[PDB]
Amino acid sequence: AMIVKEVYETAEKIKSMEIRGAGRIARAAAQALMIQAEKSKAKEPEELWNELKVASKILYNTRPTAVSLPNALRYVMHRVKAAYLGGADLETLRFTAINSAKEFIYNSEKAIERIGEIGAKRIEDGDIIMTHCHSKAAISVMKKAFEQGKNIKVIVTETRPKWQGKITAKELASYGIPVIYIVDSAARHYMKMTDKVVMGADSITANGAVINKIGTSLIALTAKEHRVWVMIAAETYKFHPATMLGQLVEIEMRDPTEVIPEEELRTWPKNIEVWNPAFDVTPPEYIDVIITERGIIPPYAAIDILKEEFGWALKYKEPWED
Amino acid sequence: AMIVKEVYETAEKIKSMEIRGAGRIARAAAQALMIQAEKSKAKEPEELWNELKVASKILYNTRPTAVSLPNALRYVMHRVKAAYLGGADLETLRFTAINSAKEFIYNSEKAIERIGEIGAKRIEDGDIIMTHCHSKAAISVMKKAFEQGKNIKVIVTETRPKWQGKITAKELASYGIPVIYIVDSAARHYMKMTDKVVMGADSITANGAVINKIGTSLIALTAKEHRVWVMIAAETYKFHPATMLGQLVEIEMRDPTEVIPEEELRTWPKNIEVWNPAFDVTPPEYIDVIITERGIIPPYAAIDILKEEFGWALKYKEPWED
Amino acid sequence: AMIVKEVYETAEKIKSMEIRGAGRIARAAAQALMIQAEKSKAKEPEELWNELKVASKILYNTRPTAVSLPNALRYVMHRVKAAYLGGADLETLRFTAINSAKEFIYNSEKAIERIGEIGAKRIEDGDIIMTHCHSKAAISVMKKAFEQGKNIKVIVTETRPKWQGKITAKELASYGIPVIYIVDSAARHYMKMTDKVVMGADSITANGAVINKIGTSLIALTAKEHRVWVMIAAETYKFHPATMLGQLVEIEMRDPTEVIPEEELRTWPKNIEVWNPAFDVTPPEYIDVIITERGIIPPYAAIDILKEEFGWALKYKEPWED
Amino acid sequence: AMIVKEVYETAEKIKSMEIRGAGRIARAAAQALMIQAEKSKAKEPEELWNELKVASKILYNTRPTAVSLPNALRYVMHRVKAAYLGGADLETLRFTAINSAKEFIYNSEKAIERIGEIGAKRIEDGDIIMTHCHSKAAISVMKKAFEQGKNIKVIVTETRPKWQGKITAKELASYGIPVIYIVDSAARHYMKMTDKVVMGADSITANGAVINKIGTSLIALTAKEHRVWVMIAAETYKFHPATMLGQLVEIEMRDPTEVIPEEELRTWPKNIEVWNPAFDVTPPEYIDVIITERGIIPPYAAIDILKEEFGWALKYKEPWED
Amino acid sequence: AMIVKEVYETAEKIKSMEIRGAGRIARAAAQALMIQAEKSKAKEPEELWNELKVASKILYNTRPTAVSLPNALRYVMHRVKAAYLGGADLETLRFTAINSAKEFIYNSEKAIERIGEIGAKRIEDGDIIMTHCHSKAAISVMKKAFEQGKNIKVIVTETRPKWQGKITAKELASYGIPVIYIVDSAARHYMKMTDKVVMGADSITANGAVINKIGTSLIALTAKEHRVWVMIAAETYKFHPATMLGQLVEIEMRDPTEVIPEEELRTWPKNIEVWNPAFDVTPPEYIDVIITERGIIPPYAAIDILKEEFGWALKYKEPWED
Amino acid sequence: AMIVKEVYETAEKIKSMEIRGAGRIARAAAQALMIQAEKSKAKEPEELWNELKVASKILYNTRPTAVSLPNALRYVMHRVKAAYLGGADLETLRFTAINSAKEFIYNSEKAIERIGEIGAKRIEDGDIIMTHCHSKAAISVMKKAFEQGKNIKVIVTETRPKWQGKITAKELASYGIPVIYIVDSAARHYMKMTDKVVMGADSITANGAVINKIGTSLIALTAKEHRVWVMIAAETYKFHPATMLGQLVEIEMRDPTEVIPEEELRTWPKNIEVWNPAFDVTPPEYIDVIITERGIIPPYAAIDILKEEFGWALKYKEPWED
Ligand SMILES: O=C(COP(=O)(O)O)[C@H](O)[C@H](O)COP(=O)(O)O
Ligand SMILES: O=C(COP(=O)(O)O)[C@H](O)[C@H](O)COP(=O)(O)O
Ligand SMILES: O=C(COP(=O)(O)O)[C@H](O)[C@H](O)COP(=O)(O)O
Ligand SMILES: O=C(COP(=O)(O)O)[C@H](O)[C@H](O)COP(=O)(O)O
Ligand SMILES: O=C(COP(=O)(O)O)[C@H](O)[C@H](O)COP(=O)(O)O
Ligand SMILES: O=C(COP(=O)(O)O)[C@H](O)[C@H](O)COP(=O)(O)O
Ligand SMILES: [Cl-]
Ligand SMILES: [Cl-]
Ligand SMILES: [K+]
Ligand SMILES: [K+]
Ligand SMILES: [K+]
Ligand SMILES: [K+]
Ligand SMILES: [K+]
Ligand SMILES: [K+]
C-alpha cells in the first residue's frame, strides 16, 4: 500500500511521546486516517480500503495501553468497512473516512468540555485538589471550577519518569490557578490537606478498574485510606470493549533511558536492570466516581457504558483486519 | 569561642547533604566534637567546655529530623558535662570528649553489623526485597543475607528528589546482588512480586511511628495492603527521647531547587510553589518489626527502648545548654 | 398569582417540621398543588398554569435535602406543563393537575406497602433490628415482618436533636413490637447484639450514596465494622436526578435552638457556635441493599434507577421555571 | 400421577449426591422431564401436563440451594405451560417439553465452554490458581488456559465433608495440569503464593452475593486480604430471580453422618450435635468478577442479568404450580 | 460503725452524679476517708480501722466503672492497713489515713497538670480538636495548648443523656477557646474537618482498651476511618489492675429516666424498655496514644503501667476487706 | 552413650503424634530426661552429663515447631549444665536432672490450671465459644467457665488432617459441656453466632505472632472481620526465645498420607503433590489477648515475656551442645 507521509510521522510521534495523552493520541490517529483518505492516489474503492486498513495497523501498533487509540480507529473503520462492503464507490468511501474522522475529533473535543462542566459541580469553594500526570479531561474539570469563581489550589505531582506534571503545573498556572508542585513520593504526606483527587484515564475495564499513568493507584490507595474523594475524568472512548470478553490490558514497558539517561546508564553494571512501566491498574474499590460526557457513574457501571456503546462490535473481527 | 575549621566544614557538609544518612551524620557529628577537643588551644577546663557547647549547637542546627545527630552529641556531652561539673581538669575533660566520641563511633559501626546479622535471618532464599532511599542499616541486612548464600534480588526505588536510590543500586550491585531499579510511583505495581520490604529510619517515636525519607509511608501502606512484611532496620540512637514527653518531630523542608533546578525554576511563574519535604511519618500499624542491635521488636515496644536507654536524661536540660 | 391558603400552610408546616418524613413531605406537596388546582378561580389556562408554577416554587423553597419533594412537584408539573403546551383548555389543565397529584399520592402509598413486603422477606424470626429516625418505609418493613409472626425486637435510637425516635418507639410498640430505646451514642455498644439495620432515605445519589438523618452514616459505619447488614428502605422517588450530572446534595442546616433551647442558648458565651446539620452522607460501601418498590438492588445500581426513571428530564429546564 | 422411574431415580440421585454440581443437577432435571414426556402414555394434553407438573415438583424438592435446578425446570415448564394454555394438542405439548429440555441442556454445555474461553484470557502464564470444591465451570477455565499453553498450577482444597476436591485434583491432573492438594484450613497459609482464585457458584443473588460450597467465603476473605483476584465462573442460570423481591436463599443442612461416619457417631454422647451446612454466602465486596457466558461482570451487575433474563416471570406463580 | 455524715453525703453525691468525672470522684472518695479519720471519735486503733473499712465499702459501692475510685481507696487503705497491722497507735493510724488521702489528692492535681503540658505539645497551631463528655484531663490539654498561643478550636459533642458536653463547651469558652457544639450523631459528618480527637478515660485495661463515656467508641471508630489521631488523656490511676488477671470491667447501667423524663416515661407502654449504659469500650486499635503523667504511650503499653504500679497488690485481698 | 529405652520410645511417640499437644510434648520430654537420670548406670559425672546431652539431642530432633519442647529441655539442661561445670559429683548431678524435670512438669500443670482461672473470667454466661485443634490450655479456660455455672456452648472444628477436634469434642462433652461440631470450612458461616474464640499456641514470637495448628490464622482472620474476641491460652514456655534475634520458626511439613491414606494416594497421578503443613502463623493484629499463667497481655507484649524469662540465655550456646 501507498501510505502517506503523515501516517508514518503521526505513528513516530505517538511512539516517541511527542504526541501524548490518551484523548490527543486518539484524535491524532483519526486525523492521520483523514489525511490518508484526503491524499490517496487510489483509483478504485479496494485500493483506498487496503490503504486505510494498512494505515490503521500502523497506528494501532504504536502504544498498546490507551484503548482510546483503537477506539478511534474503530469509530472510523467500522463506518468505512460498512460503506465499502455496501458497494460504495471511491468518492463515497473517501468521504465516509474523512467525515468519520472529523466526527470523532469533534465529539472528543465536546466530550472533554462536558466532563469539565459535570466534574466542576463536584468541586467546592476552597478545595485543595490533588492530580497526577497530565490529563486534559482532569484539567477541564479544574479549569471550569476556577472559571466559576471557586478558589481552589491544585497539588500537582511531578510524574516520573517523563515529568508530565511539569506540563500540568505550567498549564494550570497559566489559567491563574495556584499550584503546589511535589514529588510523587510526597502524595501520602499531603493527602491530609487534600479535599479531592481528580485524575484521567487511559483504559477503563469492564469490572471498573482504571488503567492510568504509573503511580495513580498509589495516589488512589492513600486517598481511600484518608477518605478523600477519587474522581476519574474519562471520555466514553476510554472504556475498553475487549475486557468484557476477558481480555487483559497490556501495560506498556518503555525504554529504561527515560528513567536513567543513556550517558549515565551505560556506565552502570550489567546486574542492574531498570524497569519502566508507564501505567498501573487502580481497582474500583478505590475510585468513587467516573465522570463521563454522559454523567457521573460508580466505577462498577463501566460495564453499562460498554454494553451500550461497544458490545455490538465484539461478535465481529477488528474492522481493519483481513 | 574558638571553634575549629572542621566543626564548620562538618556542619556545612551536613547541611548541603554531602554527608548524609542518619547513622553517618551522627558519626560525623561525634567526629567533629572529637576534633574540636583534640585541637582546642583552651587553657582552662571552662574554655574547652564552652567550646564544646558551642560546637554542639553549631552541629545540632544543621538538619532537624534525624534524632541520631542530637543523640550522638548527647552521648558525648552528657559525659563531658559530668566530668566538667565533677571538677575535671583540662586533660581529663579533653579525653572524656575524645573517648566518648570514639566510643559512639565504634558502637555505631558495631550496631549496624549486628542489625545485619539479626535482619538477615528473616530473609529467605529466593526473596525479592523492596527498599527505599539509601540506608546503611537496611543495606547491612541485604548484604549479609546475600553473603549467606541466599539468592535475593532487590527492588530499589529511585527516591526523588535527591536520587538516593542510585547510591543504593550501585552499592548493592557492587556486592554482586542483582538489582531492579524503578521509579517511586511504581512501588504498588511491583508489590505483588515483593516478598519483603526493608527500610531504614531517621527517628522512631514513643508510640512506634517511623520517620524516614519522603515516600516510605506510601511504600509501607501498600506493603500492608498486600501483606508484605515491613521491616525497619534501626540503631537504638534512632529512637527519639523527646517524643516520650509529647515533642513532635519536625519534618525538614529543603530547597525547592532540589526538585526543579534553578535554571528551570526561575522561568516558572510566581503562582507555582514547590514544596520539598524530605521525610514522612509511617504509622506503626504499617510496620511489622524494628530490627535493632538488641533484637527484633514490634513497633509498639519503641517506648521500652526509650525508657531503658534515654528516660533518665529527660528531667535535665540538653547537656550543651547554658 | 392568587395562591390558596393551603399552599402557604403546607409550606409553613414543612418548614417547621410539623409535616416531616421525606415521603410524607412529598405527598403533602402534591396534595397542595391538588388543592390549588381544585380551588383556583382562574378563567384562562395561562392563569392556572401560572398559579401552579408559583405554588410549586413556594413548595420547593421549603426544605432542600429530601429530593422526594421536587420529584413530587415534577411528577405533577411535567404533566401539567405538557398539557398546557399542547393547548389544553382550563378544565383539561385542571384535571391534569388534580389527577397527576392523586396518582403520585396513590403510587407513594403502594410503593411503601410493597417495600414492606419485599424487605420483610429479609427479616428472620428472632431478629434484633436497629433503626434510626422515623422512616415510614423502614417501619413498613418491620411492621410486615411482625405480622408474618416473626418474633422481632427493634432497637430505636432517639435521634437528636428533634427526637424522631420517640415517634418510632411509640409507633412500633403500638403495633405490638417490642422496643429497646437508646441514645444514638450507644449504637456501637449494642451493634454486637443487632442482626440487621433498617433505615430510610431522603436522597440517593447516582454513585449510590444515601443522604439520611444525621447519625445514619455512623450507624452504617459500625454496622459494617460488625458485619451487620445495612438495608435502606426507599421509594424510587428518593433517587436524585441532578446528581447524574454532577450536582452536590445540599445538606440542610437547621436552627441552633433545636439543639439548645433559646432560653438556655441566649446565656451562653459568644465564642460557642451551635451547628445543626439535619442530614449526613453514607457512602455506598456501608450499604448492603436498597429496598425499592421495584426490588432489592445493590447501592451501585442507583444509577440504573435514575437512568430509566429520570434521565430524560435532565436536558430540559425545571417544569415550574420561566 | 403416572411418573416414570427415571424421574424418581434422577431425584434419588440428586438427593444422595450421586448426581452433583449445580450445572449437572440442572441438566439432569431437564433430562428427567424430557424422559417423562418421551415415555408418557398420556392420551390427552391435560394428563401430560399433570405428569410434567408432578415430575417438576418431585425434582424441585430434592436439593434447595442451587437455583440452577428450578431455573432448568422453569425453562422447560414456562414453555410447556404456554403451549398447554395456548391449546396445544398432545404431540405438540410433548414436543415442546422434549425440545425445551434439549435446548436447556445444549445451552448449558455451550455456556460452560464459552465461560472457559472468556475466563482463560484472564489467566496468565506461570499463574498459581487456587480453587475449591468441584465446579465444571471453574475447571473449564483452567483446562482452556492450559490448552492455550499457559503453564499453570492449581491448588485444590480437599473440600470437606464430601471430599469434592479429590474429583477436581484427579480431573485436572488427567488433563496434564499440575495440582497441589491441601486441606481447606491451609488456604490462608498458601494464599501468599496464589495469583488467582477461581471458583464456581450454586446461586448468585440480586445484590452480588455468591452462594457456593461451604468454605468458599473463607477462601474469598483471605484472598481479598492478600489482594488475590477472586473470579467466580457461573452460567446465567446460577442467578437467583426470587432474591430480586427479597427472598433469602435456603442453606441446605445435610446429614451429620457425612461428617462423622454412622459407626463412630452412634458411639458419641448426645450433648454433641454435628452441624453440616453444605453452602455459605460470600459477599460481593470479596468477589472481583463473575465470568458468565455473556462476559465478565462486577458482582454488583448480577441485578442486570436478573432483570433482563428473569424479571419478567416474577409476577407469575411457578409454571409447575396448580 | 460510727460513720460521719460526710461519707454518706459524698456517696449520695457520687451516685446521683452531683460529683462526677473519674478523677474528681476519686479525689472526693480520698477526701471522704480523710474526713472520717479527722472526725473519728474512735479511742482504739481497731475501732478507727473498722470505720475506715466500712467507709471504704460505702464509697466503693457507689459507681462501678471508673477504677480511679477503688484505686484512690486502695492508695489510702493499703497504707492504713500496713500501719494498723504494723502496730500503729491511734494517732499514728489517723495521720496515716489523713496524709495518704492528702498525697493522693495532691498527686491527682499534679498529674492532670502534667498531662496538660505533655499533651499540649502534640497540639499544633490551627488545630480543630473534637472531644466528648467532660474530662478534666482532656481539658487540661486544650487549655494549655491555648495558653501556649496555639489558635485552636474545639468541637464538643453534647454527650447524651446527661449532657456533659454543655459543661465542656461553657468551660472551654470561658478560657477564650472557640467551641463548635454538635449532637453526638454528627461526629462522622465533622470528622473530615477535625485534626485530632482528645478524650479522657474511666478505666484502661491490660490489653489497651479504654472504657469511657457512652459514644467514645463511635467517635474513635470514625476517627480511625479518617486517619484522625485519637489521644486519650488519662492519669495512671485510671488503669485497671484486676484486668491483668482476666476481670471484665462492669458497665454501669443508669436509670431510664435520665434518657426520657419520669413524666413522659410513665405515659409510655410497657413493651418499650429504655436502656442507659453510661460507658462503652474502645479497642486499642482505634487509639493512637494514651497521655499519662509519665509520658506518652501506645495503648498496648497499658500492661507496663499496670505491672510496675499495681501488679504487687494482686496476690492480696482488697485493703478494706475483712 | 547408654541411652535408656524410655528416651527412644518417647521420641518415637512424639514423632508419630501418639504423644501430641505442645504442653504434653514438653512434659513428656522432661519426663524422659528424668527417667534417663534415674536409670543411668553412669559412674562419673562426665558420663551422665554426656548421656543427658545425647538424650536431649534425640528429644529435640523430633518435631520442630512447638518451642515448648526445647524450652523444657533447656529448663532441665541449663540447670544440669551449671551443676556440672560447678563440680557437682554424680549424685548431685543426678538429682539436679531429676528435680529440674519434676519442677518443669509441676509448673506446667499449675500454669495450665491458672490459665484456666484467668481466662474463665473473660467468659460470660450464655457465651458461644469457638475453638480449633485440641489445646489443654484452651480447654482449661472452657472447663473452668463451665464449673463456675456459666452456660456455655463450644463450637469445635474437626481440625484436618489429623482430626484433633474429635478429641476436643469428646473431652468437652464428657465434662457436661454442650458441643457443636463442624468442619473447618464452616468457621466463617458460624462466626456470626460465636461470642469468643479460644485457641492454644505452639510457639509465640517476639513480634507477637502465634504459631498454632493449620487453620488457626483463618479462624482468627474471620473472628477479626466479625469483631469476635480472639484469645490464645498459652504458657510462658510457649514463647520462642530465638525469634528475639531474628530466627524464623520452622513450619513442620508432615507426611502426605495423613491427608490422603496410602492405599488411595498410590493410585493418584504423579503430577498431584499433597502438601501437609501442620501449623500456620497468625499475625498479632488478629489476636486480642494472650492468657499466660502470669496474666492477660496484648500480643505485642510477647517481647516482654521473652526479655524477662529467656533473653539471658541467648548469648550462650544451647545447653546440650559440644
Ligand atoms: O496517563 C496519562 C498519559 O499517558 P502518556 O503521557 O503516557 O500518554 C493521562 O492521565 C491519560 O492519558 C489521560 O489523559 P487525557 O485525559 O489527556 O486523555
Ligand atoms: O531517610 C534516610 C536518609 O536521609 P537523607 O538522605 O536525607 O540523610 C535514610 O533511610 C535514613 O537516614 C537511615 O539511613 P542509615 O540507616 O544509613 O542511618
Ligand atoms: O431522614 C428522615 C427524616 O427527616 P426529617 O424528620 O428531618 O423530615 C427519614 O429517615 C427519611 O426522610 C425517610 O422517611 P420516609 O421513609 O418516611 O420517607
Ligand atoms: O458448590 C458446588 C457443588 O455443590 P455439590 O457438590 O453440593 O453439588 C460447586 O462449586 C457448584 O455447584 C458449581 O458447580 P458447576 O460449575 O459444576 O455448576
Ligand atoms: O466518662 C467520663 C465521665 O463519666 P461521668 O460523667 O459518668 O462521671 C469522663 O470522660 C471520664 O470520667 C474522664 O474524666 P476526667 O478526665 O475528669 O477524670
Ligand atoms: O497446635 C496444637 C497441637 O499440635 P499437634 O496436635 O500437632 O501436636 C495445639 O493447639 C497446641 O499445641 C497447644 O496445645 P496445648 O495448649 O495442649 O499445649
Ligand atoms: Cl452529595
Ligand atoms: Cl516465624
Ligand atoms: K484530606
Ligand atoms: K507480594
Ligand atoms: K451483630
Ligand atoms: K498472592
Ligand atoms: K480530618
Ligand atoms: K459474633
Author numbering:
A (entry chain C), B (entry chain C), C (entry chain A), D (entry chain B), E (entry chain B), F (entry chain A): 3 to 324
Copied sentences from the primary study:
In summary, our study demonstrates that PH0208 protein would function as a purine nucleotide dependent R15Pi enzyme and not as a homologue of the regulatory subunit of eIF2B. In NMP degradation pathway, R15Pi catalyzes the conversion of ribose-1,5-bisphosphate (R15P, substrate) into ribulose-1,5-bisphosphate (RuBP, product) in an adenosine 5′-monophosphate (AMP)-dependent manner. Monomer of PH0208 protein consists of an N-terminal α-helical domain (residues 1–122) and a C-terminal α-β-α sandwich domain (residues 123–324).
The active site pocket of PH0208 protein resides in the cavity formed between the N- and C-terminal domains and was found to hold the product (RuBP) indicating that the substrate was converted into product during the process of crystallization. However, unlike the homologous proteins, PH0208 remains in a closed conformation even when the product is bound to the active site. This closed conformation is reflected by the bend angle of the α5 helix, which is ~10° for the closed conformation. The 5-phosphate group forms hydrogen bond to the side chains of the residues Ser137, Lys240 and the backbone amide group of Ala24, Gly25, Lys138 and Ala139. The side chain atoms of Asp204, Asn214 and Lys215 interact with the oxygen atoms of the ribulose sugar. However, the strong binding of the substrate/product of R15Pi enzyme to the active site pocket of PH0208 protein by forming interactions with all the crucial and conserved amino acid residues clearly indicates that PH0208 protein would function as R15Pi.
